[model samples]
Target chain A: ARMYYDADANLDLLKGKTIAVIGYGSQGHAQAQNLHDSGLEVVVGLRKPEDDFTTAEWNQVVADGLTPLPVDEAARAAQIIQILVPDDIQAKVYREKIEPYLNEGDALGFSHGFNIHFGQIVPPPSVDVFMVAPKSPGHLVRRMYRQGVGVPGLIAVHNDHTGKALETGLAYAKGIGCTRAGVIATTFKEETETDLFGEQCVLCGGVTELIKAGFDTLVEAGYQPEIAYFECLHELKLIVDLIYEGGIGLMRYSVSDTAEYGDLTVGPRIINENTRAEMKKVLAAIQDGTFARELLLEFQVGRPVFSALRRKGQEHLIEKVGKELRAMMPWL
Target chain B: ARMYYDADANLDLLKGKTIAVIGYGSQGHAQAQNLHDSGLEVVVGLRKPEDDFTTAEWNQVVADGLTPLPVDEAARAAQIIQILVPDDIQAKVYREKIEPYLNEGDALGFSHGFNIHFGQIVPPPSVDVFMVAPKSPGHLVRRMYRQGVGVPGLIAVHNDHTGKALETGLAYAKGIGCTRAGVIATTFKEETETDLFGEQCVLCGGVTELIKAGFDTLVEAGYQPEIAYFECLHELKLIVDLIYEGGIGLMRYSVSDTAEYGDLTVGPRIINENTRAEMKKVLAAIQDGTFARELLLEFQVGRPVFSALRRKGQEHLIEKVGKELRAMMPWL
Candidate 1:
């Protein structure tokens, strides 16, 4: 729980080293821009415009005032390479374009540990490996950096062949403005397992299902869909904002006593022991590589289940109702 | 559901009526100010300074450029009385300080229908009874009004002695700026039942438990409480913001494909058919007055369970960890 602030990080560790950011996705664009703004040498590694549909990203890289090169070329040019691509494709990108160009003292970096922890992308033993992950999304990271502030982040050292992996990672964190807020030291295994479990069991999976089920329950019991949408989903932001700014106690303080009572008593009944047990199983799967294995296999076989479920989710009544209702609130 | 907009509402309906807002709580302050700013006659009703700790509210009422009077006096002076007090005491306030002053053509208004729907505060049949509920919190309501916009709201008529309950309610909605966005027409029964179900099964109850469970699962499995807090509670605002602005579909679009797949697959497993069945039972209790009965009895007996649970919640590990972590993110 010891947080590293700006004083704890040395930006000189990354001085004179070209940091190559692979992929122009959310985290990639934000981190690369922040690092460049922090006065570091940065390059964006992307697919050749002719080889893939990266013309947009190639233009964006130019617009962002940074150099863009083919993945292999960027890997060869930079002493530190940070991979920010999707989890499923990280290993393939590394094996085909990145690993061949890595030097003995070069550092390989990541914002997540899925590929590394699951043994999908094994780096050279002579190279340093680390991770610097801002907890917020790309837009906030970029905005906060521009505003002279920064989001909190997590730093992990997977390997320290050069005996400076943690320092280099901390410097990378500093360059991206993470140290301005604070950075927690973590490990690849802990970060990877916790991230996957959190997303699947609570953030993305559990919450959406909880909302959909509530909406479904109300609508099925003869309530209007618009009303159901408001009750189940639209109002959640208010409750969560309170919780985020302070904590659950603050949220309870802001709401009516009736609501607080209901929350205290009925919350357990909804996400009961059964849900907790399932959450533990979900975490176990992430920890044991079962989830990563299935996800990779799903991608390998063309993602039949993923595609079907996504389509069905889009077709849910709640989505349609929400769309119609949200149109009325222009401020959104 | 048919929505009423500014074009459908006539503010002239409230031109000569003195509107009394009984309570200076969140909704009361915002609504009274908005009404006064909209050129409607407004007064705030509070306890007498000698009788209770209403000195702060009396001063606030004066500071807001409004009149402050005891509840009974305000009720006697105003033609339209809007009760914004807590639900547990609404009936007591109405019986002792409001009901006697009501004229046959006067309107009794509320933002929530708990007391009215549950038979805790039975109004005279000769009066107009209506509800105009702004869906957002009081701060948003006030902010949006100041910004020349407004949050969406709901309106319902419980009685129409003067055959003008809906029209009067629409006018009230307009005065408070809700008509600038849109106001959905609902019924007291539908609104009360859906509100209870939502807080209990999704928004307050379901979400807090979902987060606590996720946090506990990670912590019990040897993850740092700080990291667990980030994953389970702190990061929820980001996910819920996406969901709020653009529904669950947009949230799915914003996250990683791995996260989306995990959400689509694992979500239902965590909040499965059993949860859905439980949600149905929760809704049934709301519809059948079972929850209302229990809540009223609990309050009557001095709220022992409520007090104990609140203390326990305040002392929870998540709250402690969240407090320590939130200190690092000053922007919050």
Candidate 2:
């Protein structure tokens, strides 16, 4: 279920405050503009002026009243600062462009707890520390707001410097129209651990493996590379679209009973009890920060493993077949 | 490179032939109608006449002048019959409804080759055997035709009874507007093996596990479920859409440099050499018919494993999150 703090959440809570948004990417650009649309004083913080989009991209957001400012000026102007940069860069940006300007009574916030939760960008005890993470992407976040609807989000409080951090967190959520959808509560620790784990274990890690494996199976069996690519990788979006929109039930309902029955029977045979045990081991690695240690080491070595993988990824038949087939669908 | 049969292909081979499309599902409905519209004459062949919606759900094809008939009548009326039912029921349907009525000179056809290739639904050698599979979903196949475009398809010939079976296959491809998109030549052995392998090893089986693994990694690493779900699952569609539209390189270009770097740097470590090794095993099972053996057993056992996995699939958190989020974006 969802909890909604409607017009009852006093916008007066934000009256004397200027909120600073760091790094105007998806989260930053949408949040700053959405807050402005909702009548909050919003300023963007940038590490370098060049971070501004090309005139075209900037025009799209600026038309919605989003403005950009240097990190220092924005920090000086705002009582609350929201950091929305990449996980790997936020720490360095915080130390250089943000930490020096912070005052004792100010508020520091995040859409994700990647840096603060990981102790990469820890703030002093005197300021509010909070999170208002939307469950959807930034474009959807802003689009839902203008349409008078909203996307659901998760609100969590880490440290309450002003004794109203929780209230402020929810308020920030409302300003971006998350209240129109709904907002849940969570801790920074839970947010950080779960987010990192999901990406490494599922999104970036898991799906890629699934696709590669499927490709391998067909190709090894003396099937044409083109057919292998189409049946495995290209058709995935259709199955997922059904599942995402309705549920696995609908996905099953839509596909051939052959595919569905196979899915029902073979899925477990592949993922099964052994797979869950593997998942837990993967989880354990994250809990112990062993995954992070390996990642940082790869980074320190300028990502030789990463480079090699990308090169191999380039050679995948899925990419080649996809390129040719995609040519037929002009709209895409 | 891809080999394509052009408009020069002879279809006089199927001119006097009657065609029966069993089970009026998406692919069945579209292909049958397209064939009938092309003047080869067609019928909706089914075990139960009520099982077909050719007169209702597929009103356009009906409006274009198609008539409905039972499987036996279709077999008696037409020189060609195409089976389009769930894999498990295909053998039962073939034995009871189709085979008894099939004539010695009639051509046997299919949209998928699972039954024939796996020896689950073998036809008498007197009948020619082939398959014409649209590469896209049925609705899109119909939509493209109406829009003056076409959907791509794969064509395979298992048995050329009259030495002109491939021509009949090409003619059907042209009827469905697939020739407009381009048709690739293949074999029943290739189609069945690759399609089965791709779905089990990659599309349905492997991708779901991969998503789970990524989600687990993030949550284990102390990240919020909210954020983890977004990075692993929600964001995947956008990336896939880009990849679908243009290739992997283009997809990488559209995303943020931060995410691209993350993908480039991190995707390999998680998928790993071990993951590829696992993929080979998964594929091998498909090639050696180990997967096919299990599917047959599940069907014979009344599908206990299939039913259970379907129930479990409905319980995934990512599925829950996606439902709420997609509804928020009505455009999708």
Candidate 3:
């Protein structure tokens, strides 16, 4: 890791600058609050809900001792504007509310690279653009601070219009306590592609699919659905926690010899050469922007497939049994 | 689920009977302590260090206010013997220490089905055999009880020589706080097969290989491994937590539309038809006892493949990078 530790980042780089955090959602609230706590000047930009004006998020920003402003107004008031809204909405928000007020030499930052990499929310060449993403939820980012710990992060400089873009990105990372956990340098392209691939192939898409398939196979083959859910999904946490804390090596160490042997011999069988070849195809699509283009097209067409797939997922046999079974464990 | 709620399990059944908990590992210590706290006549069986036992576990058992005895002595004193040792060591321990002291109508219990289902430890026909396996780590079982909640579990009746084996098993479940969550009925055959399949195909084996493959693919394509680790491994906790809290639909709901789209489309491509067919074969292997036979044979012959795989896993590129990367996130 070309890791820049906490000592390598200077919080004083942002001493005289105000960072306008656009949006008050999950990452937004956490980043803005962390910056505020780090003694950086932070102004949150929030739009009153269209259907409903007030939200818990708006109240949360206020309670965290930061005042909120409209998007355009906030952009005009700060040296750095960090976009933190959802990806689909970011482009729309940037065009109508941010770009007009986006000043020359002002830094435009992001937590994800989707908009910039896909050319959906292109920034002016006169301004610096960068990313500093904390690798955790808003609560953990906050919770870790109280414990004097912080989540790791990734930083990428898309276009360093100012000579200080890298340093500025590091400073923002430090302000959020990310430097405590260390930050690895990446590019807009690398960060964007890897993040999408991670979510789609390994984390979100692959795991859920693997779980559902295993669950279905067991149930379809005359095993009880409840037992299948136990094996396929509920037991996953026990295994994943071991992997997360230590690597797969440690997870293997902890399970039974029976489990380890089966895992060693059968795991590869389940995700073998044929599977890896398909993964390559998935990666190829991500690299060529087929996924991005299609996603944007779906948005343009009102997300018919996307919305239906979601409903179908919720109605899956695993989910139905999981709901009934999870209710028994009130602790979850 | 065919579940037995708290009302169905009688904690009073343990009031007059002595329950001896053997082993003091993850599930061991937690179950003993919970049963003790639940006002049962609980004694923990502790073996003197055989180049194996630790002062730490012995101290812990004493500190938990439970008396400890040698394996044979504990079995002689208790009507119910709850075996919680590792699968590899269980048969030997049962044959030498437990079997001689076992008496008629004294229930023999286990938290897993590996030993019994695989015929590694066959009980005498006069003795009742039952199982009550909690669906979580020991700490969680104990911690949730403090929070007035409990993790779920499974209870199975293998050989009900005493006709009261189901009631005895349910009593054990309630004593360990599993009744607070719920307990599903299973058989030794079903529990053993499903548990092994779950760990091998989905949880322990499949997920790790999936992650390593994804990480390797990205790194081979020239992305920094740190970035790949963050994307493939570190970020997984965030995604899985969402799935654990809700389900696949909620996980997709929580991520970016781009990620959701990729997952909805690309995920299936990564784990499609061939993968499911392989999973069926893996299940068939588990069901037909091929996996069990091999696992037991490995143990019998000193586990050449098992030890080699463990070493290989530790030496893997993912483990190497993952170790360095995890150092950055102290909170984990």
Candidate 4:
């Protein structure tokens, strides 16, 4: 229940350490820059331009005034290494490029705990492993830092071989400016399980399905796909923004009494007891490693199912209708 | 399927008519100001300062250089009247303050079709009844109009007794700057039913339930309420904004592969076939007027159930946790 502020985090712990940020994607780009701006020694670990077609990342790192190196070399040069790669590729990148160069008492870090919590990339006992995850997206993290404010973040320590894992993680959080707002302490198990369950059951999986189901129900009932798209998908941003700024109570206050009534009565009917049971089942799958194993197998098999589903989602009637409708709204 | 643009709408149709915008609330405030700024004669109808506790609305109407009058006086003075009150109060406001003032060939307008579609306010056959609904919230409507761009809107003609109902509606749309972007033609039935179905089953009801369920699941399973709040609710705004701006496909493209895969696979399990069936039943209730009847009956009984639910929602753990957490989020 305790929250750490800037006063509580000792950025001095990272003062002498060369921090290597692996993967120059969303989190990597922003976190590395924030660390550098906070007066920390930072290097960006990346694949060679020839190895990855995304050569813009290398140029961007150089433009941001950070040293760039291949993953193994960066790993060897830094005392603290933060892996910000995608979950599927993290293990492969870590085993081949990071693990071999990790020295005794060196710190291995992450912005997420998926690979570590699932035992996909186990670190040696001599090294410290920890996580410092900003709750907001990378852009907001970077933007808020520049504004001299910050987004809330989470910190967790998995291994503390040097007895400084927590302190190092707090320093990392401070470098990213999260400690300017606050940081909640969580565990690798809690973070990985809850994050997976939430994305699957509420934020990503549940919401998209809820929208598509509503869109389909309307279109099948002979409503125009355009109107269906507006009602089911486009207006969601407005409702969510109210909730994010205040809470559900504020959102209800801002809407019509009719909508509030409907939200109170019918919302439960749609996401009913049965849906809650399914959510629990999904959470159980994450907790028991079922989902992680399934995802890894899907990746191992070259993601046939993932590819097909992505394509199907792209071809959905809601997506098609939304594209045409969004083109008309210049503000979007 | 046809869209109306600025060129398609002739503003000359309303060149000599006074527009009375009833209710100085969200849609009313933006719409009336937009109409006035477009060089139309606009009047805002509001209760006297003593009758309503919210006196800022009257002051605001005066500040905007628009005439403010009692509901009956504004309705009597204008040739075209737009009712912008809440759904529950529209019928009473219409019967008591607006109906007797309607002159032959005068147009009665609304932003939503609830009262008209449900037969709560039956206009005389001599009057033209239509709807011009800007799709975005009031602030976006005002801001976009100011920017010389405009949000998309919908227009529906319920009664065209004067043979110029569509023309008057088009002119109204143009004055509000909707035609600068686009306007789609719809029907009162389609708009009312689809709007109801969407709010009840997807936008307000479905999403809130999805979030509450996820938060409760995590908190019950021994995760920190702070972490659960972050995962279940706070992150939804980021995800929904992507979906709104680009569509679900772009949202998936922006997220991690793990989240995307889970969204594709676990999403269906959470809002599966049963949920879709419930959605259909909800939509059917909207179409058959069952929901309207229930809402009316609930209102007639002094909103006993509505009051209890509202109170319960305010006292919910998520709201409590969110209030504390949002305080820490400076960006919010």
Candidate of highest DockQ: 4
By lDDT, the better pick of 3 and 4 is 4
Which residue pairs in candidate 1 collide?
none
In candidate 4, how many Å is residue A146 off? 2.0
Q: Tell me, by TM-score, which candidate is best.
A: 4
Q: By TM-score, is 1 or 3 better?
A: 1
Q: What is the interface RMSD of each candidate, in Å?
A: 0.9, 3.3, 1.3, 0.7
Question: RMSD (Cα, Å) of candidate 2?
Answer: 3.7
Give one digit per residue, the lDDT tens place, for model 4 in B125-153.
Answer: 99999999889888888888999998899
Rank order by DockQ, top first?
Answer: 4, 1, 3, 2
True contacts kept of each: 0.93, 0.48, 0.75, 0.95
Rate residue B73 of model 2 by lDDT.
73
State which candidate, 2 or 4, has the greater TM-score: 4
Q: 1 or 2: which has the higher TM-score?
A: 1
lDDT of 3 by residue, A213-237 (tens): 8898889788889888888987787
Q: lDDT score, residue A137, model 4?
A: 83
Please give, for residues A25-101, the per-residue lDDT of candidate 1 as tens digits: 98989999999989899989999897345888899899989999999999999999999988778888999999889
Clashes of each: 0, 29, 0, 0
Cα lDDT, model 1, residue A132 = 90
- The C-alpha RMSD in Å for every predicted model, in order, reads 1.9, 3.7, 2.4, 1.6
Across A1-332, the per-residue lDDT of candidate 4 in tens digits comes to 87899999898988778999998777898899999999999999999887355588888898888899999999999999999988888899999999999999999999899999999999999999999989988988899999999888999999999998998899999999999989999999999998998899999999999999999999999999999999999999999999999999999999999999999999999988899888889999999998889999999889999999999888898888888999887567
